[PDB]
Every structure is written in structure tokens, then in C-alpha cells.
């Protein structure tokens, strides 16, 4: 996150760091005692070298670490250049006992609409400057949902955003998520309800003509339920 603020430690206990060889790769959200939901493109890796670490604030600390038993990419995930259905479910090799620093975030009803103008936030350990370095501490940025049609404008995302995609803007031009922040959760409203998982932007993270976009969670709720084994 560029221009973001350090979270009160452990105020977002549903946060996961997906890590390759002990180095932060993507955010994730714990949505069941045994499953973290993250971005599908984050899994273009040697699974053997990946871990999920829960209950963190400083990246430089143990936190509670899990091996991954399975990585279930949405059945219709389409990689870049499409980047359609960009979600993956990761099964922990253990079961979270909910505490004060580690607990799942509830899924939204499947009938949730992320309307334009909705006030949200997101958190991550992603880069704090263009071409810089990971944040050392968990951070947050407030974001508002933009109108998708306007976001699909030729000078913006060029007709390329689908109805399952949530288009985002910070309050100022120099605030944006950046490399490391994808997979992280977009939570919206007074109830800080799960509404999105961050996906992509442009190569320049603060590019105002290429605003950050998250995958909407609601349309995927029934697949998440099937996969994690409820209904």
C-alpha cells in the first residue's frame, strides 16, 4: 500500500500473508477455520515453497504458520491478459482456533451488491512506493467504489471490466495498493463486511487512469461454500 496507514496491531485478525520461502507474496483472507481466500494469479508458484502465516502485524515475526494442502483456483480462472475469475481457495494443513489475533471473516450473502459510492477499506503488506519494498507492518487504505461504466471508459480500463469486478479509488491521487496487496480483502460499510478480494491495476500503482480493481465476493459465495464444505 502506497500512502496508507499502519493498522492498530491485530485489528484485522482475518488477514493472511501468503509467503514463498519466508518472503511475503500476496494477501489473503481467512473465510473458514481451514481456508484462506486469495487471488488466483498468486499461485503461479512451486506450492512446496509456499506457506500461509496468520496473526501477523510485522512481517518480521513468527505469527502462526500453515502448510497448504490444496489450492483450488476458480474453475473458470483465466490468466492475464483476461484475468477473469481471479480467486483461489487455499486449504490449511490444520484448523484455526479463533482467538483475538486470528479469526475468520464472514462471507457476505450471495445477494450483496457493491454499489458505486460504497465506502470500503483494504489492508496489506504490499509495496509502499513504486518499485520499492514491502511494508514492514500491516497497512490499510480507505477506498470508494467507482462506477464500472466510467471505469470502463476508453481512457480508463477500456471496456475491460466485467460485472464481477469492483473498481476502486482512494481519496487522493498518490494512494493505492501496490505489488504484494493482491489477494487481500476489500471490506465495506459500517459493518466492515467482506466484499472483495483485490486483483490488479496497472504497472504504475498510482496511475489514475488505471484504478485498482477487486473481484466481487458475492457472486462467488456459493462456490466458496461448496469448496470449504458448508452451505
Amino acid at each position: 500500500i502506497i500512502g496508507g496507514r499502519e493498522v492498530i496491531p491485530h485489528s484485522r485478525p482475518y488477514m493472511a500473508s501468503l509467503q514463498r520461502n519466508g518472503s511475503h507474496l500476496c494477501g489473503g483472507v481467512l473465510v473458514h477455520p481451514k481456508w484462506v481466500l486469495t487471488a488466483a494469479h498468486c499461485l503461479a508458484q512451486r506450492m512446496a515453497q509456499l506457506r500461509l502465516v496468520l496473526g501477523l502485524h510485522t512481517l518480521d515475526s513468527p505469527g502462526l504458520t500453515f502448510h497448504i494442502k490444496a489450492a483450488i483456483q476458480h474453475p473458470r480462472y483465466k490468466p492475464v491478459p483476461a484475468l477473469e475469475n481471479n480467486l483461489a481457495l487455499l486449504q490449511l494443513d490444520g484448523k484455526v482456533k479463533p482467538s483475538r489475533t486470528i479469526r475468520p471473516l464472514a462471507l457476505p450473502s450471495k445477494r450483496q451488491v457493491v454499489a458505486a459510492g460504497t465506502r470500503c477499506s483494504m489492508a496489506g503488506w504490499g509495496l509502499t512506493h513504486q518499485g520499492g519494498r514491502l511494508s514492514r507492518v500491516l497497512r490499510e487504505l480507505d477506498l470508494q467504489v467507482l462506477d464500472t461504466r466510467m471505469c470502463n471508459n476508453s481512457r480508463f480500463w477500456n471496456g475491460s471490466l466485467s460485472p464481477s469486478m469492483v473498481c476502486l479509488a482512494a481519496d487522493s491521487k498518490d494512494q493505492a495498493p501496490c505489488k504484494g496487496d493482491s489477494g487481500g480483502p476489500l471490506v465495506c460499510g459500517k459493518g466492515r463486511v467482506l466484499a472483495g478480494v483485490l486483483s490488479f491495476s496497472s504497472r504504475v500503482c498510482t496511475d489514475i487512469f488505471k484504478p485498482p480493481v477487486a473481484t466481487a465476493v458475492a457472486p462467488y459465495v456459493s462456490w466458496i461454500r461448496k469448496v470449504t464444505g458448508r452451505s
Partner: peptide, 7 residues
């Protein structure tokens, strides 16, 4: 064209 995962 230019989607870049926050990878």
C-alpha cells in the same frame, strides 16, 4: 493489454 496483477 495492461492488466498487472497486484501479484
Amino acid at each position: 493489454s495492461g492488466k498487472v496483477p497486484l501479484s
